[PDB]
Amino acid sequence: EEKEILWNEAKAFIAACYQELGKAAEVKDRLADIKSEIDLTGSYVHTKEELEHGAKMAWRNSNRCIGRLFWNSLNVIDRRDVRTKEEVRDALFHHIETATNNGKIRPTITIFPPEEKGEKQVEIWNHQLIRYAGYESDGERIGDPASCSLTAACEELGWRGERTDFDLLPLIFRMKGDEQPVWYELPRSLVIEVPITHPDIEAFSDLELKWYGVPIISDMKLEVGGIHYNAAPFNGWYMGTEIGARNLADEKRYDKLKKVASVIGIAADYNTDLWKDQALVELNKAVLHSYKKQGVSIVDHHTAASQFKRFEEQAEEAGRKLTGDWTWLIPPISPAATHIFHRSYDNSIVKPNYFFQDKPYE
Amino acid sequence: EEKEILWNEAKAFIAACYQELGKAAEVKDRLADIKSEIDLTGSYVHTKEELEHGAKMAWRNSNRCIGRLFWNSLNVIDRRDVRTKEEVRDALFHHIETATNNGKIRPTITIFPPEEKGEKQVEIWNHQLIRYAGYESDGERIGDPASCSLTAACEELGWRGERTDFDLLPLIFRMKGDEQPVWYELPRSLVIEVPITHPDIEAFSDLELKWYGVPIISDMKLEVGGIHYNAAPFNGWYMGTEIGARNLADEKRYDKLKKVASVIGIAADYNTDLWKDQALVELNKAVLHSYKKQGVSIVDHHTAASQFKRFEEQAEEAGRKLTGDWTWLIPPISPAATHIFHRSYDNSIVKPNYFFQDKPYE
Ligand code: HEM
Ligand code: HEM
Ligand SMILES: Cc1cc(N)nc(CCCCCO[C@H]2CNC[C@H]2Cc2cc(C)cc(N)n2)c1
Ligand SMILES: Cc1cc(N)nc(CCCCCO[C@H]2CNC[C@H]2Cc2cc(C)cc(N)n2)c1
Ligand SMILES: C[C@H](O)[C@H](O)[C@H]1CNc2nc(N)[nH]c(=O)c2N1
Ligand SMILES: C[C@H](O)[C@H](O)[C@H]1CNc2nc(N)[nH]c(=O)c2N1
Ligand SMILES: [Cl-]
Ligand SMILES: [Cl-]
Secondary structure (H helix, E strand, C coil): CHHHHHHHHHHHHHHHHHHHCCCHHHHHHHHHHHHHHHHHHCCCCCCHHHHHHHHHHHHHCCCCCCCHHHHHHCEEEECCCCCCHHHHHHHHHHHHHHHHHHHCCCCEEEECCCCCCCCCCEEECCCECCCECEEEECCEEEECHHHHHHHHHHHHCCCCCCCCCCCECCEEEEECCCCCCEEECCCHHHCCEEECCCCCCHHHHHHCCEEECCCEECCEEEEECCEEECCCCEECCEEHHHHHHHHCCCCCCCCCHHHHHHHCCCCCCCHHHCHHHHHHHHHHHHHHHHHHHCCCCEECHHHHHHHHHHHHHHHHHHCCCCCCCHHHHCCCCCHHHCCHHHCCCCCCCCCCEEEECCCCCC | CHHHHHHHHHHHHHHHHHHHCCCHHHHHHHHHHHHHHHHHHCCCCCCHHHHHHHHHHHHHCCCCCCCHHHHHHCEEEECCCCCCHHHHHHHHHHHHHHHHHHHCCCCEEEECCCCCCCCCCEEECCCECCCECEEEECCEEEECHHHHHHHHHHHHCCCCCCCCCCCECCEEEEECCCCCCEEECCCHHHCCEEECCCCCCHHHHHHCCEEECCCEECCEEEEECCEEECCCCEECCEEHHHHHHHHCCCCCCCCCHHHHHHHCCCCCCCHHHCHHHHHHHHHHHHHHHHHHHCCCCEECHHHHHHHHHHHHHHHHHHCCCCCCCHHHHCCCCCHHHCCHHHCCCCCCCCCCEEEECCCCCC
């Protein structure tokens, strides 16, 4: 019955994919080959063109993503050939280097061998390839609480963090056959970080905030035509609010708004003063400014929404249904100033797509 | 079959209502009386206690409302006795006066006779009892575009607006039996308005913004135990963002952000400057400040969310399911700074409730 589900997802995908590629004539023959490949082997192997287009369709179908206008320029790196932990480590280091591109960030995905029988070939433990550690013990809170459990798991494996608020977590992943993952410290030369300064409030530097340049999500599953690529890390550039309104601002993350309020010189005493809102705006201006100043790609939420409107228009012109999750598409800063807020979106799940999967730790 | 639906909604309501009122023993007898009243007459009449508690339950069940903590202190005025247009007009003037309460606003609802056979007894045309007119002709845009169609309908009836950006619309309503509604100009003595000034930017006054004190929604239907009170205007006090982030800010409403940006002295040239966001925060500070300074009730969105959290806790403690519409509960300014943003809500519709109904104009 496994062959059955797989075959159905493959027909649907190849038909859709080849139609978009203008290769509609080649479908019947490609599907034949697939059909006997599934029979003989229990699975099938994507061509480089299918895998590339699939990863691109999956981004286009990600309901939560405002950045989708650029789906068709995704840089797909095919690493289905890897067999050893050194190869994975080097594929992961290369992805960081090439996606970063000296600050001019290239949306990239590196695709590792897929699941075989539900059996993972490579299992990445990181939530993002570049992320800060978090520690919580004896009342003390250091670093990013979102990382606290993975940080504790790395420290079970003989890694030790310096316990700054910005320790980079090592890459950590497990190969099939191994009972424990291995970890490798990131070469600092590969990792761009941006110190947060404000364009006109000189004291803002006193907070000593920084963030890393590239969000490289490494814990989702790419599903393309029934094939499950559980290890396929991908990146874009940040939208400023992700850093300024959530990572640095959330009470359960870095929780910096009171400190922001103090350095910009406003009281943080009365809700009616809207000091959180004012602090949020200044922190978000700082973030955009700082990335720009350092020559690292970033997009503000107004420009991002204006790009997403073009994505909507493009979908319509192409005859494609648009899907989206309004609750994640709206930015957390001035959402009613974007067109997104004032319309609704069909939150249907269309495949190919990226999916959440269970963490091997916790 | 009409008796059938009505009877079912009545059983459900009386049982629930009397249980909450600790009058559970009186249900069987009250339901008997109702049953024969529906038989004889085709309907039934609520007791003053049922009608009051029903209006209060309806507020408690309004999924879109963040202000619900205070549901049980709603002031219910029973005006089911009205039969003439002078009586309706005076009930409506009284509601404005008593709800305003010299600025210390009292959440109030005035309940008019309900629909009889689907036939309305009184049909209110206003969306709110106090609202500004809107005009759009020959490229010119004056006043509130949200009012443009009702404004045009009033002007068909011999009313003429002065064409300021803040003309008060007359009360306009139709009595059953009349083919046309009547209109009555609001006595300005009854209507509190608040000029918008900023606590520390003196030039803000140059915009000459103002807004009215009390939002009195007059176009929804109150449904209680199968009875349809299509005319039952109700009010609370504003949450500042309704005025500052939407009525004064939306491009399709007063559209004031560019003007705000100019008077607070920031450029409105680059999305990455976050000038809309900064303008929004300053406009919203001004609004809160101005209401407070004038002694008119208002609540900021942080305090409102903190009150709503208590409503959630109270619902849990009482064993009541909570319902809510996340998409309307989040404020349009810094939504991620409220707890509302970080949880989900069941958007089920529970009765008694307030419902949208079709406008008689347009
Ligand atoms: C090019 C710049 C990009 C920007 C500015 C962008 C922006 C965003 C934002 C703001 C979110 C919401 C995240 C949150 O609030 O937690 C998001 C979610 C997402 N984006 Fe994009 N994105 C970009 C590129 C990409 C790429 C290249 C892919 C995949 C190939 C992708 C797939 C997704 C997915 C799957 C989610 C949902 C993640 C989850 O469920 O946790 N995005 N994006
Ligand atoms: C006491 C102060 C109150 C505050 C601060 C408050 C706040 C709000 C807010 C902010 C909204 C969203 C409006 C929008 O974005 O369009 C809303 C919706 C609503 N409120 Fe309240 N509210 C209050 C009192 C009341 C009262 C007294 C009732 C009824 C008895 C009520 C019933 C509703 C209803 C029915 C809606 C949805 C209206 C619609 O569907 O268009 N509220 N409230
Ligand atoms: C590629 C990319 C570019 C860009 N600018 N931004 C992103 C953001 C992806 C989200 C990253 C953080 O997501 C974490 C924190 N919020 C949700 C959590 C991920 C998650 C968790 C769970 C339980 C489910 C789910 N679908 N996704 C991705
Ligand atoms: C009582 C009260 C207090 C307070 N602070 N705020 C309110 C706000 C009620 C909403 C007033 C404005 O609503 C208008 C503009 N947005 C939605 C529209 C009303 C509406 C329209 C439609 C088509 C459906 C619907 N359910 N409601 C009500
Ligand atoms: C965290 C919680 O699930 C909440 O409902 C959602 C909704 N809105 C969001 N929107 C974005 N872009 N990112 C998020 O993490 C969340 N959180
Ligand atoms: C206007 C459009 O329907 C949009 O989806 C909604 C969602 N969020 C909202 N939230 C509130 N409080 N008020 C509104 O008018 C809207 N608009
Ligand atoms: Cl992030
Ligand atoms: Cl309003």
